[PDB]
C-alpha cells in the first residue's frame, strides 16, 4: 500500500542520517593515538593447578567474588564448586536436565544459577541450615534456549534466550518485571556494567544493542560484524566493550562514540571465537578461539602477545579473577586449567 | 598430612568422598543408549513415541536388559546450528518420514509439496559435519494409506521422471531408493530402512537390532580388531 511505501522510505532516510552523523565524528583512529606507547613483551603463562573430575564437555564457568572459589558446568549433569587454592571440591550439585549452556555465581556468594536448552533458569542456595544444597526458585516463560544469565543483585537476575528476547526477573515473586525486545537473531551472550545500570547483548544478526535496566528500553545499536556474535564483555572502565564473532574477528566498540575502534584478526586464523575477557587493567584481551587454544591480544596495539595451548579440544569458557591474579580456562576435554 | 592442620585433613577427606561419588555416578550413565528423534512435521513422530512408550522431551524405556533414552527436540523453534553440536555423542539417529504425503501441498507455498521438504531436511541432517559417523534409522510411516492413494492419483506428480507399474511395491521401492541415494559417504555411515507395521513389537525389535550392530562396530574399532 501507499502507507507501507512511505513508512519504509522514512525508515531508510533515518539510517542514512545516522550513518552520516556517525562518520562526521571519525576525526582520528585509536591506532594513531596509541602508536607511541611501548609494546608489551611476550606474555608467558603456566598451568599452576589442573582441575579434573568432569566426564563431559564443559560449557560454562564463573569465578567467585572472593577470587578463590569457582563453579563449572558440564553436560554430564553435575555442577561442581572448586577451591582453586587447594584443588579440593566443596560442593557437587546434580542437575535435573543434563543439557546446560550457562551458569552464574552470586556476588554475595549465597546462590548459584544455572540453565540452558530447557527454557527454565534454576537458583540453588549454598548456605542452608540443613547443610545440603536445594533449589530455591525456578524461572520460566522463555520460548528458547537460554544463552546467558547474570546476577544483578541478591534479588534480581537478567537472562537472555534464543527467541530474540531478554527479560529481568524477580526471585522473590518469580515473575518477569521487564522484557527487552528488538533483536532479529538469537541472543548468544550478555555482560553487565560495573555499576549494574546498563548491559549489552549480542545476537545472531551481527548486531549489539545497549539496554537500560531501569527504563527497560533500548539505547544504542552497534553493527559491523559479518556473522554470528558469540561473546561480549565490558571494559573495566565501563565505557567500552569487546565482541567475538564467528568470522575469526574480534572488535572493540565504544559507548560515547558509536564507531569501531580496533579489529583483532590474523590471516593464519580462520576459526571462530567462543569466549572474550579482559584483564584487571584492561590492557590484555583474552579471546578463546575454537582451534584448541587461546590467544592474548593487546587492547591498545591489536598485536598478539601470547598463546595458551594446553587443551586438546575446543575452548568454550574463560574467566579472570577480580584481583587479576590468575585466569581459568575450560574446554571440551573435561579439564579446567588455572594459568598464572 | 605433614603440614596440613586438623581442619585441612577433614577437608581433603570430604573431597575424596565427592570424587568417589562422581566416579560411581559416572559409570552408571556409560551403559545407556542415547537416541535422537527427528522429523519433518506431521510425519508420525508422535505415533512412533506411543509405539514404544513405557523445550526438549526425554523418554526412557528398557528392552532386553538394555536401557534406551530418546530425546525429542522438534519443539525448540530456534536456530538448528547453534545447539546441534550438543547431540554429538548419540549412538544413532531415528528419522521419521511419511510416504503418503506425496500429494499434499505445503501451507506456506502451494507449489511446494511436503514430500520434497522431508527430502531436503534428510539431506541436511545426513550430510552434517557433526554426524560423519552416526548411523541413521529411517522409518516410513503411514504406509497403509499409501496403497489407496496410489491408485486414484499416480505418483508422477512428485516424480515426473518415473515410469513404473503404478503398484504399491514398485512405488515404495522407488521412494526408498530416492531417500537412500541422498547419502554422500557410503563408507562410514549406514542407513537402515524399515516400514512401520500396525503392531509395536516389530518396530522395537528393529531398533534393538540396529543399535546392537552399531555397538559392535564401535567395539571392534575401539579394540583395534577392525
Amino acid at each position, epitope marked *: 500500500g501507499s502507507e507501507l511505501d512511505q513508512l519504509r522510505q522514512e525508515a531508510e532516510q533515518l539510517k542514512n542520517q545516522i550513518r552520516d552523523a556517525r562518520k562526521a565524528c571519525a576525526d582520528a583512529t585509536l591506532s594513531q593515538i596509541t602508536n607511541n606507547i611501548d609494546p608489551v613483551g611476550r606474555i608467558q603463562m603456566r598451568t599452576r593447578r589442573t582441575l579434573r573430575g568432569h566426564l563431559a564437555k564443559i560449557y560454562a564457568m564463573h569465578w567467585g567474588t572472593d577470587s578463590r572459589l569457582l563453579v563449572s558446568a558440564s553436560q554430564d549433569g553435575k555442577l561442581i564448586i572448586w577451591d582453586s587454592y587447594t584443588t579440593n571440591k*566443596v560442593h557437587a550439585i546434580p542437575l535435573r536436565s543434563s543439557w546446560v549452556m550457562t551458569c552464574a555465581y552470586a556476588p554475595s556468594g549465597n546462590y548459584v544459577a544455572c540453565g540452558g536448552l530447557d527454557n527454565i533458569c534454576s537458583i540453588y542456595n549454598l548456605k542452608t541450615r540443613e547443610g545440603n544444597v536445594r533449589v530455591s526458585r525456578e524461572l520460566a516463560g522463555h520460548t528458547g534456549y537460554l544463552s546467558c544469565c547474570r546476577f544483578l543483585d541478591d534479588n534480581q537476575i537478567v537472562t537472555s534466550s534464543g527467541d530474540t528476547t531478554c527479560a529481568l526477573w524477580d526471585i522473590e515473586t518469580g515473575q518477569q518485571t521487564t522484557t527487552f525486545t528488538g533483536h532479529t537473531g538469537d541472543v548468544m551472550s550478555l555482560s553487565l556494567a560495573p555499576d549494574t545500570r546498563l548491559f549489552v547483548s549480542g545476537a545472531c544478526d551481527a548486531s549489539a544493542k545497549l539496554w537500560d535496566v531501569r527504563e527497560g528500553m533500548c539505547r544504542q545499536t552497534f553493527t559491523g560484524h559479518e556473522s554470528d556474535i558469540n561473546a561480549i564483555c565490558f571494559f573495566p572502565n565501563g565505557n567500552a566493550f569487546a565482541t567475538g564473532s564467528d568470522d575469526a574477528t574480534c572488535r572493540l566498540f565504544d559507548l560515547r562514540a558509536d564507531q569501531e575502534l580496533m579489529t583483532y584478526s590474523h590471516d593464519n586464523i580462520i576459526c571462530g571465537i567462543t569466549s572474550v575477557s579482559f584483564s584487571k587493567s584492561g590492557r590484555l584481551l583474552l579471546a578463546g578461539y575454537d582451534d584448541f587454544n587461546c590467544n592474548v591480544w593487546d587492547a591498545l596495539k591489536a598485536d598478539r602477545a601470547g598463546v595458551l595451548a594446553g587443551h586438546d579440544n575446543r575452548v568454550s569458557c574463560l574467566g579472570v579473577t577480580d584481583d587479576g591474579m590468575a585466569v581459568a580456562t575450560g574446554s571440551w576435554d573435561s579439564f579446567l586449567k588455572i594459568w598464572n | 598430612g605433614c603440614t596440613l592442620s586438623a581442619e585441612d585433613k577433614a*577437608a581433603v*577427606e570430604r573431597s575424596k568422598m565427592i570424587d568417589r561419588n562422581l566416579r560411581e555416578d559416572g559409570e552408571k550413565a556409560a551403559r545407556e543408549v542415547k537416541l535422537l528423534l527427528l522429523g519433518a512435521g506431521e510425519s508420525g513422530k508422535s505415533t512412533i513415541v506411543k509405539q514404544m512408550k513405557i523445550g526438549i522431551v526425554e523418554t526412557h524405556f528398557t528392552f532386553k536388559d538394555l536401557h534406551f533414552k530418546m530425546f525429542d527436540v522438534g519443539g525448540q523453534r530456534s536456530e538448528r546450528k547453534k545447539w546441534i553440536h550438543c547431540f554429538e555423542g548419540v549412538t544413532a539417529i531415528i528419522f521419521c518420514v511419511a510416504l503418503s504425503d506425496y500429494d499434499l501441498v505445503l501451507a506456506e507455498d502451494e507449489e511446494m509439496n511436503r514430500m520434497h521438504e522431508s527430502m531436503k531436511l534428510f539431506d541436511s541432517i545426513c550430510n552434517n559435519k557433526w554426524f560423519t559417523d552416526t548411523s541413521i534409522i529411517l522409518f516410513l510411516n503411514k504406509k497403509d494409506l499409501f496403497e489407496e492413494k496410489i491408485k486414484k492419483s499416480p505418483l508422477t506428480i512428485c516424480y515426473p521422471e518415473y515410469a513404473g507399474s503404478n503398484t504399491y511395491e514398485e512405488a515404495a521401492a522407488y521412494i526408498q531408493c530416492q531417500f537412500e541415494d541422498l547419502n554422500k559417504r557410503k563408507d562410514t555411515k549406514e542407513i537402515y530402512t524399515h516400514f512401520t507395521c500396525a503392531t509395536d513389537t516389530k518396530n522395537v525389535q528393529f531398533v534393538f537390532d540396529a543399535v546392537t550392530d552399531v555397538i559392535i562396530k564401535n567395539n571392534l574399532k575401539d579394540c583395534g580388531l577392525f
Partner: single-chain antibody
Amino acid sequence: VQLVESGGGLVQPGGSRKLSCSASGFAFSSFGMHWVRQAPEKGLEWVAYISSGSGTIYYADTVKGRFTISRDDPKNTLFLQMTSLRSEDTAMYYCVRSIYYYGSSPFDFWGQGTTLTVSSSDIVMTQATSSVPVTPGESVSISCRSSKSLLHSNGNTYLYWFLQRPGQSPQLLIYRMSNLASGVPDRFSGSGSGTAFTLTISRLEAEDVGVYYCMQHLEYPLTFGAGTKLEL
C-alpha cells in the same frame, strides 16, 4: 534441627553402659560428630570424634582404649560404649555436630545433654579470671591464654568462643576467633593475637549471664579453658 540423647543413669563401678543420640532435621550422613564431657561444678573436656563415613576415629588420651564410638548413617544414630567406668567417670555428656569445608562453622549445634553417675606437648588453656561482678549497660572483656601459637601457616587461628547459660546447653558464639556465628547479635566480638585472646561485649543485657569457655582446634586432643562466670 535437633539432637536427642538418652542412656544415662546410675551404674556400679563394675559394669558397662552405652549412650545413644538421635539426629533429625539435617543431613546426618555428611556431618562429623564429637562427644563432650562436662564434670559437675567443673570444666568440660573433649572425649572422642568420628568423621563422615567412619574414616578417622580419634580418642582422648585420658580414656584411650576404653571407650568405643560407632556411627549408623541409615538410622541417623550415633553410639558410644564404655566398658569399665571408674569413680572419675561421672559427668554430663553432650553431642556436637561439625562439618569441615572452606567457610564452614564447626561446633554449631550442641544437643541437649545427658547425665551419668557412678557410685563410690599438649596445649593447655588457662583463664585467670573466675568471677567478676558487672552491671548491665557497660562493656565486658574476657581474656583467655594459651601455651603455644595457634596461628597456622595458612593464616587461620583455631580458637572458638562459646557461652553456657545456667541450665542450658552451650551455644557457639565465635569460631576461628574472628567470625561471628549465625543467630547471635552483633554486640559480641572477638579479637586476639599470638597467645592472648579477648572477647568483648559492647552492650550488656540480662540474657548475657553465663559461663565463657575458650577452645583450641589446632591439633588433637582438644583442650578447653577454665570456666569464667559473670554475676548480674
